[PDB]
């Protein structure tokens, strides 16, 4: 009956990610119901990531002193109820939708920090990896389903409020079932040494760049492609297509990166950083062509999205392997936590807000007609290729010192005892 615990937690994860990307798929409508420009339509993701950030370490703490099942179920009930209750705000108040997003952040962070530990401490060496693998590869599926269901429900029911009321029913169901089918079961001196590790610092910066690009683009593309359709005198079959593409590029990129690094490990001992760098630079070339193909044709924009989207994810399976190769085995928990926080901070906590802000600054200094909506957004989203190229150069910088850092680690472990 452990198969049931695994399967129920996997469904919980799909729902977790489905309820992050249903505001994005109806973003165009929020603005027309509350009267806000772009800058105010970025706060809906900036505040979510700020709350998730700050709440994850604490729910990591309180998760092994006291019970667990209780904390999982409480988190699910909280975020499901706040989501459902937030589709009743009247038009006059905007800050209440933003507060909604903050509380949803707290609840989701709790669940996502605790479930892996439970599904870890129930299995063995030869199958733990398979269970964690199947649990994790529920990320692209949920992310795509977000856009899909938001668009479909809003299209059939004819009123966008209904987008925010269908997930929480499943939320309550899963939250009750995780109560009957689960069997319950010197960092200050670390940082002084982690901070002198050149490979570690450069790998952390080059993860920040990837999150910046992913967050900005994943909230701001569907709206941009709509504005493109309007200018070209051709017109919801936009978010449907974006969801469909992401649901498959997510797997394809990871398989690509694993395979290439496994062939390249037998020719030299700088395999992982060089694979990662070549992938990033290729993705930057193919991203910077959406904002050229979109003025004229749409199929070209979609092919460009496919290729750039695939090559950007190839380095998800690998940065863990770069961490476990230059850090001795007693300083690995501190390093994973510190890297995850920093990835969130210099990355997509303030990416969507920045794109919105730049777009509004451009628009305010020209006329206001649909053409200039389209151009303003196009000329604001041109930061993503720039920062992606920086990420590529940071992987090359780590591939410089990979060998010296592995050597120092080996001396340390044998020196301890």
């Amino acid at each position, epitope marked *: 009956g452990r198969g049931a615990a695994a399967a129920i937690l996997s469904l919980g994860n799909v729902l977790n990610y489905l309820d992050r990307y249903t505001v994005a798929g109806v973003l165009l409508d929020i603005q027309q119901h509350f009267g806000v420009k772009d800058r105010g339509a970025g706060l809906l993701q900036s505040v979510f990531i700020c709350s998730f950030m700050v709440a994850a370490p604490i729910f990591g703490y309180l998760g092994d002193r006291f019970n667990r099942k209780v904390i999982l179920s409480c988190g699910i009930f909280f975020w499901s109820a706040v989501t459902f209750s937030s589709s009743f705000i009247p038009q006059q108040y905007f800050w209440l939708l933003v507060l909604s997003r903050g509380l949803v952040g707290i609840g989701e962070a709790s669940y996502s920090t605790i479930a892996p530990t439970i599904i870890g401490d129930l299995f063995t060496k030869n199958t733990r990896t398979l269970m964690l693998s199947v649990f994790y590869f529920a990320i692209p599926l949920g992310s795509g389903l977000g856009y899909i269901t938001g668009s479909s429900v809003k299209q059939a029911a004819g009123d966008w409020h209904w987008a925010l009321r269908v997930s929480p029913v499943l939320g309550m169901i899963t939250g009750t079932l995780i109560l009957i089918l689960v069997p319950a079961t010197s960092w200050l001196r670390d940082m002084k040494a982690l901070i002198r590790n050149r490979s570690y610092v450069f790998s952390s910066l080059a993860t920040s760049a990837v999150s910046f690009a992913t967050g900005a683009l994943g909230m701001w593309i569907p709206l941009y492609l709509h504005r493109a359709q309007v200018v070209q005198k051709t017109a919801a079959k936009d978010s449907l297509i974006f969801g469909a593409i992401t649901c498959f590029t997510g797997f394809l990129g990871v398989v690509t990166g694993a395979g290439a690094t496994r062939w390249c*490990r*037998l020719k*030299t*001992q700088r*395999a992982d950083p060089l694979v990662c760098a070549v992938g990033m630079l290729g993705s930057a070339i193919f991203i910077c062509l959406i904002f050229v193909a979109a003025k004229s044709s749409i199929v070209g924009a979609y092919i460009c999205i496919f290729v750039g989207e695939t090559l950007l994810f190839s380095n998800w399976a690998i940065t863990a392997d770069i961490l476990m190769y230059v850090v001795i*085995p007693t300083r690995r928990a501190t390093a994973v936590a510190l890297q995850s926080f920093t990835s969130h901070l210099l990355g997509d906590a303030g990416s969507p807000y920045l794109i919105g802000f730049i777009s509004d600054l451009i628009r305010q200094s020209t006329k206001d007609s649909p053409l200039w909506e389209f151009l303003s957004l196009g000329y604001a989203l041109m930061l993503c290729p720039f920062v992606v190229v920086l990420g590529g150069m940071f992987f090359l910088a780590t591939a410089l010192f990979f060998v010296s850092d*592995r050597a120092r680690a*080996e*001396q340390q472990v*044998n020196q301890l005892a």
Partner: nanobody, 126 residues
């Protein structure tokens, strides 16, 4: 794979030299080596291991002082030199390559290595 050579029948007080090498242009320089062994009524246990950059070596508890390990990454080879053998060392010897660091309290763990060999038998009569 990795291909092993040496092995055979010696007498107590004898000596032997085993080698393990990679066929092709493969390199194994990201990591090459550790030597394991197995006997009929018992379980597989690590015998020794050698690191990647420095040239640091580690041995099990019963063979310390009698075995020696060496690595040659200029032509993809690893060597084990066995001196003053006994009747207790009759077994099958294997060669394996994995990613974890070279440390004491790492030898015994073998369910995590990437590539394995097939084995070469050593018999020490009386």
């Amino acid at each position: 794979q990795l291909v092993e050579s040496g092995g055979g029948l010696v007498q107590p007080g004898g000596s032997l030299r085993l080698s393990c090498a990679a066929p092709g242009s493969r390199r194994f320089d990201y990591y090459t080596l550790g030597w394991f062994r197995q006997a009929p009524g018992k379980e597989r246990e690590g015998v020794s291991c050698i690191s990647t950059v420095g040239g640091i070596t580690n041995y099990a508890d019963s063979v310390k002082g009698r075995f020696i390990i060496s690595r040659d990454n200029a032509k993809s080879t690893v060597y084990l030199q066995m001196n003053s053998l006994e009747p207790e060392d009759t077994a099958v010897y294997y060669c394996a390559a994995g990613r974890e660091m070279c440390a004491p309290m790492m030898l015994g763990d073998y369910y995590d290595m990437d590539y394995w060999g097939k084995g070469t038998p050593v018999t020490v009569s009386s």
